[PDB]
Amino acid sequence: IHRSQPWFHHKISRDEAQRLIIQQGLVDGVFLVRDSQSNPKTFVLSMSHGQKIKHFQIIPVEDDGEMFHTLDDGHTRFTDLIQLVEFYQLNKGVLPCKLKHYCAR
Amino acid sequence: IHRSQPWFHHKISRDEAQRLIIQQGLVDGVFLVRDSQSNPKTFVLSMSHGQKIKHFQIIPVEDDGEMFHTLDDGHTRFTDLIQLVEFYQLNKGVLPCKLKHYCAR
């Protein structure tokens, strides 16, 4: 379902993701989400902050027969990537800063 | 937009909200959201926990020309009530427990 979102970049490499973020001038909050390069399939949040690029693995966690997505070891859970992104666009949580400007697909 | 959600009860009184929650057997997590009885219009989250009913005011807060909704003095912000509810259904935050079972409209 997240495949339709403008901030999701279907399977680009880490280097490619970094190139894009870097070419935005390393402004805090620039970001994008992409598919994991490793298997099983999880997801990765790539963003810039403090003139550096940070990657956060988005993993699936279970609880009472249900699976959720998280990037802070389950302390903050989400049903899908859309809910997770829109949450982090307004609240930084464990992130160095909020998700302010997504890279264009 | 939240007006369509099954957990939102358009303008019922506090007593009515408590009657409904109480008649569910005071199970932790039972809840509902309703319009504020006071003006200006804000919103109220009514839920049961520990055999008691708790009401949390959902207020609007501003930041950089934008308005958000919150129930913890802006520490956790949301664009609308739907995002706020779906977040609290999975994460308790400052609430005594998660929003588990909404009362039927």
From Swiss-Prot, chains A, B:
Coiled coil: none annotated. Expressed at high levels in the liver, kidney, pancreas, testis, ovary, heart and skeletal muscle. It is found in: Cytoplasm; Endosome membrane. Signal peptide: none annotated. Residues 7-103 form the SH2 domain. Disulfide bonds: none annotated. Belongs to the GRB7/10/14 family. Adapter protein which modulates coupling of cell surface receptor kinases with specific signaling pathways. Binds to, and suppresses signals from, the activated insulin receptor (INSR). Potent inhibitor of insulin-stimulated MAPK3 phosphorylation. Plays a critical role regulating PDPK1 membrane translocation in response to insulin stimulation and serves as an adapter protein to recruit PDPK1 to activated insulin receptor, thus promoting PKB/AKT1 phosphorylation and transduction of the insulin signal. Interacts with the cytoplasmic domain of the autophosphorylated insulin receptor (INSR), through the SH2 domain. Interacts with GRB14 (via BPS domain); this interaction protects the tyrosines in the activation loop on INSR from dephosphorylation. Binds to the ankyrin repeat region of TNKS2 via its N-terminus. Interacts with activated NRAS. Interacts (via SH2 domain) with TEK/TIE2 (tyrosine phosphorylated). The PH domain binds relatively non-specifically and with low affinity to several phosphoinositides, the best binder being PI(3,4,5)P3. This is Growth factor receptor-bound protein 14. The lineage of its organism: Eukaryota, Metazoa, Chordata, Craniata, Vertebrata. The gene is GRB14.
